[model samples]
Target: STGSATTTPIDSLDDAYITPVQIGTPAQTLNLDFDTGSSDLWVFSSETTASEVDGQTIYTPSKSTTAKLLSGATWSISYGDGSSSSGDVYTDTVSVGGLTVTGQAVESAKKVSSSFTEDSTIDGLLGLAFSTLNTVSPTQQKTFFDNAKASLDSPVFTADLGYHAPGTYNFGFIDTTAYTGSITYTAVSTKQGFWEWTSTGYAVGSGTFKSTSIDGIADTGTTLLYLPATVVSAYWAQVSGAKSSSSVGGYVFPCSATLPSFTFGVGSARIVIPGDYIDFGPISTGSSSCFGGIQSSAGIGINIFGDVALKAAFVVFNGATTPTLGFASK
Candidate 1:
């Protein structure tokens, strides 16, 4: 959600996101970038060839107190960035929060791209987005959710974005206590990948953005919101006229400047984006421009609504009853 497919130099702890989920036996720890653009829980392995791996943390089977590997099955992944990795498949116990799941399918990339090989701070990824983007196959495998659902403390899983960190991914319980008033629940579609929605259009300031102007996608994998070029141009046109100062990266409008509220159209549901979130500036050079909660992706295929948007609501991913997505604000 924060950077392009290439040339992103991440440092802040804000950039490092963590999700506590159950994976083979020992509760495995995974650090993810919080991507809504794609859905896949990926990790590195010591078995990976040193030259091919970068930036990503590779888990060594020998290093883990408890580790299991699938002898026959193999795994591979290719990102929008054009980077890819591959390795052997395995089954083990994976846990997040208090939920424990066994026989969870996992991948250990033996051949990783240079981008993944360069970084050491980043290690594993825990995908909380829709199941459709999941790289794990249902026919030949069972994902963490598929195996863990039976042992969950509740029938639902909730991802809370507003917390000590960007958010906390909880399994088996829909915590309605997080909502301030009666929560509005949205239905989901039975499909694969991150649960997607039909976006009618987008809004900026108090004005509804013109249709055929921008593209957006509601992605749980992404941690922030992104917009297309024309949409960003049109948005800034309004902000600039409002006396909001602009800086190098995207739109660096003054935090004190009066800004208009923006909203995204989801059928009858209007997802509001606060002004404060739209005025964000980058922590570093060439970093993705943060316009409060919205940033410009220069026409990336879809707008990822990551944790920044979901943190305001209680997100429910239903994989057991049906392949669908649900959300409610407490």
Candidate 2:
């Protein structure tokens, strides 16, 4: 029950990772966004309103003899950034990499927000987070990872996200060669259905380590690294001209600023994110000020260790009854 596949970045900023997944009996190959932050494996489909369908590849359950409509079942989910979708449910043959689930719950979109329609690359999203986060009413359904865990060799999956290169997501086993040094395991809290954990310490660049407990979620679906206001303020203070801007909506710094690497402690391992990663490109074309990837989570409420942090290490998401998150440098 092992599987592996490369996740390709859709854009230069490494906005999101897309992997090809096979669904239905005839095997419709769709490029899906693998989201560890959400719990519904919903897709654009034949049921989606035509106006909402732009360039997305939709799943047609009727085309697959193995598809079974879960009559009366429906689901709706709203993301923090105002992105949302709702859909009817169906059980169908779904496979990713090499792992196949014969009766995986597949939510076919009946409606989607403008944000989804505007983004043409993602055909759908395959949520790997805990199933309890699913928004299906009357009855909740298991996520793709949850459904395939039992069949896995060790009930785990590893996410190896790259800066601008393609990385592999290995299911059922960890690829030792994908990372260096030793992996530090930290117990994860599935509360809120997230791969949340407590970080023991942090340091800005080569500065002294600050002993503090910071709780955040490992979210592969997101782009930046959100942290406490205090940490963020301290980080920017090190820069020559960095400030939190309201008009721009985030921390911005001089394009020439030699940004410092951000480091966070997990168990005995310390993962470091280079300054280049923190420089999230210029806010506007030819702009002198660049948007910072490491920003304050003040408004976000929950800090998120998104792709910016995930790409700095090899992350293992073990889906045992009691799941744990493991990290190692690459």
Candidate 3:
């Protein structure tokens, strides 16, 4: 979060946020975030009173002749920030890139506020992360994979964040062209809504130790990976030699260092935590900054592997077919 430039989400302003495109056809234009933190396909509606939500893209059911509404059901979502919205259900002919999925269920917010409204660029979030955290119920759940899983060239999904251009979140399969051919896999535990793993322990440089068999979950919803104080301190102590006084807040190390990496032996897989991630900055007070890794949520009995760890690999949540998590090289 520190190294990257801040983003200002665009507002839909009552225009069509989800565009339509046909496979083998031209790619349509649309703007939205592919979110793994939550699962559900919803768009801001133009019908929504601006008084309630100042500036937002509202999906007008009338725009699409194929739009449908679920029977009399209403929905509402609450975030960690305490903001919330409630509305009815509407299904419409939604399209993205060269794919078109009809009868898509979308939340029509009658009351909207919070970060969702503040950013004009974020028309709405396309939750590809997990099914467990869907704002909509399990039976009513509809995801990007749910609609296009059958037509995707491969049954795998890969998200390639653009380092120099616009980042991309691709569904259907992982593109092996981006990596050197070696990809690792890790099993997931359903203890929480997020795909979680067990923490084996900490390591400095090439040194290894037991993870205390401590386990942690991977949450794409969160932006940072939070570790226990003991694990964090142990990690930084080893890599501190790479730190410099002029570096900003978090753990800013010389990107070239062969920094320490942690591995978790989950079931039959070994998930590796690269050294670049440990170089975080401070986000808290008293010596604590937004370093690549954080010691904030430790002692809570579990660690959360956020975007820092996930953006490194191609993650596949096989919820549509199985209760498993698959990883591949991005």
Candidate 4:
């Protein structure tokens, strides 16, 4: 038999989802972001200095009878968005939904950046990427999924990210009813420690689909879709008054502008992103300017099919041999 879990929208941000995770012997519950872009399980903890800690919840390792310190071991991580955390290590029992893995390496953050400190609701991150991406020093640590895969009925997970609604992250099993039609499978390349794949082509609005391959990763942690500069430019070209703005941090356009649907190819299936979703709301309250959900992945090098893209379909992260990606309409 396999275990499964459901994740709900953390707050009004509607940018990320959080799942309940039990850590330590007495089972301390933590609301963690299941980030596919990273590979660390660090949480805000008592070890963090008072000044570094803000409104975020902290995990008290001392309260857990089963917590054991891994002497001389530590971990530090920095995200592309500039958020970072680092601290000592502890071995404890970590459970997700009905599945439990004993002696999992849990990093306790002694320091955190302003980005994490300001996000009071999120306790930490649970990396869903391959264990090879873990950031522990001297020796690497395996992710909870990696350790539990051997015992799962099926080595697969499904990410059902929704827009302004609750979603589920099913582990070790795929819920066929959650999706419609047939699941379109695409081979994944894990050399980069991401669910990397190439889209066969893309199209803007009613334009013809261009068969230009684009390499990218499916990242649930990210809030927007990132594509090549050329692709981003082409999409924005259709919107009048749309222009790249450094002050606004990406492409911005008038709030009243009509946006066309964006489409991308996954094998033979074409996934269309609705125009409403493409306009990620106004840039600021009482402002008529809005930001595009799709931006250029220039500095990052690799494109990111973030939450904006994932929410459009049901995504299956099949961990079987070759680790394929299966997508279908929700």
Candidate 5:
């Protein structure tokens, strides 16, 4: 059966989006961040330390009759931002947007980093990346989407992230009415457990498109767009008062600066990020300094097309024999 779900932004367009998911027999509903960067369906659980559990909701496996412990199995994951979580594993009935998957592995977090505890709104994370990235030891786990794909009419999912608005995450089917033009398709390499692809090139504002090929991952978990340092420098140069600041930890510019549009290539399709979107809010409210939405991916190895860039277009994560990505204007 086909299924879909809608995602709501937490605070801003750049922040992570949350969707409701049901777990266990009675269907304990939890708001989870659907992340495309990692593979692990973990939740804040009763096992979490009291000190680490703040305003977030915790999943109590004992409360669910269908919960079964996978003895000796455990999971641990770390994020690029230093956030992490670790715990034992359990197989339970997991449902998302009316779709159900039986015996899905759910990691119950016993310990979490301050970054996760501080953000009480996120109860857990739903990984949408390739199953190869799953953290379950001894036997890898499959994502909710992976287990449900065989029953789906089509092995596809679409992300329509909006700016300051709610977006829809459709699974098993594509809504033709959601996009404006023909979808431009490009092959994706999943060797790294990420949806990595090469962009033909990019340009700033009305400048000519360069032929510099860039290899990057389309990550929903990341907030900003990260590119090569030189490319980032070139884009920031167009902004009058933009500069990299050590104290700010990234490129920052005057709040009033007139920014140029940043465009990236996806085959022949040009996914353009408007100039206004480049101003990723002020560094501090009422402050003249603003953080750039685009920064250098130096030291990270792979570039990341995060929310700032993905929200600009309609993206399809096609799970076919040869996985591919399709992009189009929304």
Candidate 6:
């Protein structure tokens, strides 16, 4: 009814977190990126040609007695940059942590391209987003969580991402011991299969919080925080050395400059992101200039509450009849 999966950041950059997923009877376990922003459980497979395979463990469905082909089922998803992965579908016994889900939709990669091949650390993506976002043709499939939720003690999953540290994803039960005080629950919009919610406002350091509604999605798959351009400008304005560098694209500042904490509101409650967390990383190898974690959402088309903001608090994705998101201080 419940499961706990330990997700570790791919690198110190904290780009994304990967969790081990077991498939089939022999347990062809592979470390997959647990992306809550997408809805395809695609993977590197034995069917993927050698030219595309690069240092990733492939899942050979033929080797698994429990694996069954979802006849004529195909899926294809494209990226803005042209890289994509598309292939036939299969039903298999998928296991995460200790929980086992039978006949889970597993998209097997037959056509692998640039975007997926480059990320060697991630074997594939185990999407937890709404099944409506699934790309399977003819019959859209349910996500692992949607299927697993049937027997869950509580149909909720909690994300406890850390800054350059180990994190956890708990399904079914919310561990009260994991967070402090009460969880502030807020309504979420499932219109686009995203954990989209509105933040009451934002505060830069100890400054007065500007009370304005900011709509964004709490995406675990995204690496950085993105907000309105005006909000981003206000944040950078506080830093004397900060500038929008054409060379680096977004805002960058001298690594020595002190940064103020960033705070955002969930209903009336506030979640503070320490200044250190906003200092994403050096612009270049051994460079004095550093990139800011918070950036303008102008190009993204949608505002996103990425890891930069996510690591600051405990988040609960409540998948009840009416979905809602809960935020808590830790």
After the best TM-score superposition of candidate 5, give how far the Cα of residue 44 lies from its true spot, in angstroms.
0.6
| TM-scores, one per candidate | 0.73, 0.98, 0.69, 0.96, 0.98, 0.96
- For TM-score, candidate 3 versus 4, the one ahead is 4
Q: Model 3, stretches more than 4 Å misplaced?
A: 1-30, 49-56, 81-83, 129-133, 137-139, 162-165, 191-193, 199-214, 236-295, 298-302, 328-330
For every candidate in turn, the CA RMSD to the true structure comes to 6.4, 1.0, 7.6, 1.3, 1.1, 1.4
Q: List, residue by residue over 181-212, the lDDT tens digit for candidate 3.
A: 45555556654665565644544556765547
Relative to the true structure, candidate 5 reaches a TM of: 0.98
lDDT of 6 by residue, 1-330 (tens): 899989999887898888999999799999898877888999999988778888889999999999999998999987423668999999999999788899999999998887778778889888888999999999999999999998899999999998889989999999999899999999999998889999999999999999999999988888889999999999999999899987788999899989999999999999999998898779888999999999999877888998899989999999999999999999
lDDT of each candidate versus the true structure: 0.55, 0.92, 0.53, 0.88, 0.90, 0.90
Per-residue lDDT tens digits of candidate 4, residues 1-330?
Answer: 466677877655467788889998788998999998888999999998788877777789899999999889999999989889999999999988888888889999999999888887788999988899999998899888888888888998889987778888888888989998889999899999999888888999999999988889989999899999999999999999999999999999999999998998999998888887787778998799988998999998889999888988999988887798988987
**Taking the tens digit of each residue's C-alpha lDDT, what string does model 1 give over 125-237?**
55545545566543356455555666665545655555224455556665566655444444454343555554556777678555552334455445456666565566666
Query: Which is the leading candidate under lDDT?
Result: 2
lDDT of 4: 0.88
TM-score of structure candidate 1: 0.73
Which residues of candidate 1, in runs, are more than 4 Å off? 1-16, 21-39, 51-58, 63-66, 117-119, 129-139, 163-166, 190-192, 200-202, 208-216, 227-233, 241-259, 265-269, 283-299
lDDT of 1 at 303: 56
TM-score of model number 4 = 0.96
Off by over 4 Å in 4: 11-13
Candidate 5 lDDT by residue in tens digits, 129-210? 9999999998899998899889878998889987878888888888899999889999899999999989989999999999
Task: Tell me the number of clashing residue pairs for each predicted model.
Answer: 49, 0, 39, 0, 0, 0
Q: What is the TM-score of candidate 6?
A: 0.96
Which 10 consecutive positions of candidate 4 have the poorest summed lDDT? 5-14
Please give the TM-score that candidate 3 achieves against the real structure: 0.69
